[PDB]
Amino acid sequence: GPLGSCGGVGIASLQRYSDTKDGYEFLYPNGWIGVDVKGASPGVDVVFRDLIERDENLSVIISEIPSDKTLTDLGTATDVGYRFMKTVNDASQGDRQAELINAEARDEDGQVYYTLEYRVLVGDNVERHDLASVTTNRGKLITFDLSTAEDRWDTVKSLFDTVASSFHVY
């Protein structure tokens, strides 16, 4: 049914991206460019940058979880939340500091979704707020790291969660 068709299906609007290999798919606005970051931080696969808004940056990290332990076994929302801070700080523990705002998890359709909320501090001021969500699918580790200016973060607060939650796996 959803075989689709080859044609000018792509229009000046929202685009759909899917990957059978990673088993994940999400929507994103047009005007965005994909940059290759092979050999980057472990798990890092591809990064998306919005030409329209240089300030706004999105990063995608894909990794495989050990069959012996799952997202739940790995750690709790709070535990994983703290681990993530150390992971990021490991390379940014010099001048910038990562603060964990909150961390919660939800269970729907038998699928567990982990939500991580944190912000980046510089010197004596907040640099920006970033939302990160973690979810496993068939042993595939999928993370959605979105970053946006604090000036409108409140206005588009749901936007970050929406994109991360909008994602689908298969």
Side-chain angles (χ1 to χ4, degrees):
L3 284 288
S5 185
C6 283
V9 70
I11 64 180
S13 192
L14 308 183
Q15 290 61 233
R16 180 179 183 173
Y17 184 84
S18 301
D19 194 3
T20 304
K21 190 87 87 184
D22 178 19
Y24 88 134
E25 62 186 353
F26 64 96
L27 306 189
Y28 68 112
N30 63 19
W32 284 19
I33 61 179
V35 188
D36 293 347
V37 292
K38 67 187 193 190
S41 254
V44 176
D45 185 7
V46 185
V47 68
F48 288 88
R49 183 180 292 188
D50 185 6
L51 185 68
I52 301 172
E53 300 184 284
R54 304 185 188 281
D55 293 348
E56 187 183 2
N57 316 272
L58 189 144
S59 185
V60 185
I61 310 180
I62 302 172
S63 187
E64 41 284 346
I65 74 188
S67 185
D68 294 345
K69 298 184 185 167
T70 164
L71 183 66
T72 64
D73 295 347
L74 201 172
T76 68
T78 303
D79 192 6
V80 175
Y82 276 115
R83 297 275 284 182
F84 195 66
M85 293 292 111
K86 186 174 66 159
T87 305
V88 176
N89 295 343
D90 189 6
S92 208
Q93 55 184 173
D95 292 349
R96 302 186 189 179
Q97 299 184 78
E99 192 185 2
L100 185 70
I101 293 170
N102 63 235
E104 299 183 351
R106 292 276 186 76
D107 185 84
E108 299 183 351
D109 187 7
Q111 187 70 40
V112 184
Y113 306 90
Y114 267 38
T115 303
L116 261 63
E117 193 179 345
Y118 73 91
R119 64 189 185 180
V120 180
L121 273 153
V122 74
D124 188 85
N125 301 129
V126 181
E127 186 183 1
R128 66 190 186 287
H129 289 258
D130 295 346
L131 185 74
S133 303
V134 184
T135 305
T136 46
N137 193 61
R138 202 186 302 194
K140 284 57 162 175
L141 218 180
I142 302 172
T143 298
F144 237 129
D145 291 348
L146 299 86
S147 68
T148 279
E150 67 84 2
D151 292 347
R152 298 183 69 80
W153 180 268
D154 189 6
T155 305
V156 288
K157 60 195 291 309
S158 186
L159 211 185
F160 313 119
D161 190 5
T162 304
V163 173
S165 68
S166 291
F167 93 133
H168 190 87
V169 304
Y170 70 96

